[PDB]
């Protein structure tokens, strides 16, 4: 009953960079998949709740990254030749042994950041570079671990809309909730 389980992967990464650059004030298709001849897709249903948790989880992870240490690309240099290596070091960092939730969302907004500063540094070709590294790592290492136990339905069950704040408030039961009456 397949249909877009592997193609949807490249759809989540491409949609994350489309809204990322759109935030500042730059286009994405301008230097990404510019080659015409597309597939159009049926409509995209997994990105509904999935992309949703990726937008609130990407803005909360970024706010906590600078609010807890500093910027990401600000520390990187970015350039067509040693850029994939930079994202390669941050990738191994997160992977402590296998694939635990949380590092996947931080990796989504992380690559999107390198794409923003990339265009600002006259690195259009660099943007497309991170686009293939994001859809590849997602369809390579995160592929055999997501389909294993619903990696998108689960990623949304723990990082749903405002799930980060819901883990400290929605807790209630084992948290402490004083209303047993």
């Amino acid at each position: 009953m397949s249909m877009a389980m592997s193609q949807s992967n490249r759809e989540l990464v491409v949609d994350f960079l489309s809204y990322k650059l759109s935030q500042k004030g730059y286009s994405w298709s301008q230097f990404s998949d510019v080659e015409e001849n597309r597939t159009e897709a049926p409509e995209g249903t997994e990105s509904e709740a999935v992309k949703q948790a990726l937008r609130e989880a990407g803005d909360e992870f970024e706010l906590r990254y600078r609010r807890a240490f500093s910027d990401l690309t600000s520390q990187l240099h970015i350039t067509p030749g040693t850029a994939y290596q930079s994202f390669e070091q941050v990738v191994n960092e997160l992977f402590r042994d296998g694939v635990n939730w949380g590092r996947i969302v931080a990796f989504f907004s992380f690559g999107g950041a390198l794409c923003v500063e990339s265009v600002d540094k006259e690195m259009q070709v660099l943007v497309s570079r991170i686009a293939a590294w994001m859809a590849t790592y997602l369809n390579d290492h995160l592929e055999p671990w997501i389909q294993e136990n619903g990696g998108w339905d689960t990623f949304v069950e723990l990082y749903g809309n405002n799930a980060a704040a819901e883990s400290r408030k929605g807790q209630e039961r084992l948290e402490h909730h004083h209303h047993h009456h």
Binding site: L72, Q75, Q89, V90, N92, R103, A106
Partner: peptide, 16 residues
């Protein structure tokens, strides 16, 4: 490289 080592730290404060 400093990134990555801290990207996981925030994970705790925001883990599920």
């Amino acid at each position: 490289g400093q990134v990555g080592r801290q990207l996981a730290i925030i994970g705790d404060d925001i883990n599920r």
